Design a protein around this ligand. Structure first.
Ligand SMILES: COc1ccccc1NC(=O)c1ccc(NC(C)=O)cc1
Ligand SMILES: O=c1[nH]cnc2ccccc12
Ligand SMILES: [Zn+2]
Lengths: 159, 39
């Protein structure tokens, strides 16, 4: 039961998410191999994802994490890029669909840099690029990133 | 690594962040976009 609320470009909530997307673009060591060559985005659509069931599921977990982390959730707004964005907005994030051989194990990965999450939109290392043109640096095909509430709680530092 | 280490709720890779339970993230905003061709 997911509702998408289309935000107007003149809405401050749209502009806030727009600016976080544009301002967190970085130069990448792969020189654009994974996510393409760009300094900015064409922001076409920002929709608020409204799902009561998935939100209560989130806030319930957040409370449990707070009580185990000195009454603080350590909540962060972070980007997620994935070929499975359509499934995530309808059924929620699902650890059961995580690849076991990730750098930090079978987990769901987030970035504070939009350009980092952009590298995973078409798969690991940008996969084979956009479906139509097989181009990781495609300027034509429309991409989708999630800007997510993430409860980190007590976060284990790893190199 | 299958779950968070004991007493922990996430991993900070160094910066990327990893959770091991789907219910610890909510996909609040769906952003449709293109990467811009540099002029
Ligand atoms: C097939 O997929 C799904 C289908 C339905 C619900 C959820 C999902 N999938 C995920 O929530 C999901 C997110 C991220 C990763 N991987 C990394 C690298 O972060 C894997 C699975
Ligand atoms: O959003 C992401 N999706 C998939 N893999 C990642 C790896 C590192 C940082 C972010 C991501
Ligand atoms: Zn394309």
């Amino acid at each position: 039961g997911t509702i998408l609320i289309d935000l107007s470009p003149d809405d401050k909530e749209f502009q806030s998410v727009e600016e976080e997307m544009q301002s967190t673009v970085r130069e990448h060591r792969d020189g654009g191999h994974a996510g393409g060559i760009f300094n900015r985005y064409n922001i076409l659509k920002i929709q608020k994802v409204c799902n009561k069931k998935l939100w209560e599921r989130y806030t319930h977990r957040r409370k449990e994490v707070s009580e185990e982390n000195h009454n603080h959730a350590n909540e962060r707004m972070l980007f997620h890029g994935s070929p499975f964005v359509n499934a995530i907005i309808h059924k929620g994030f699902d650890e059961r669909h995580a690849y076991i051989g990730g750098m930090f194990g079978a987990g769901i990965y987030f970035a504070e840099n939009s350009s980092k999450s952009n590298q995973y939109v078409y798969g690991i290392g940008g996969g084979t690029g956009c479906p139509v043109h097989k181009d990781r640096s495609c300027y034509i095909c429309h991409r989708q990133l999630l800007f997510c509430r993430v409860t980190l709680g007590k976060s284990f530092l790893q190199f | 690594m299958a779950h968070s280490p004991p007493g922990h709720h996430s991993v900070t890779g160094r910066a990327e962040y990893v959770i091991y339970r789907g219910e610890q993230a909510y996909p609040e905003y769906l952003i449709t976009y293109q990467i811009m061709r540099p002029e």
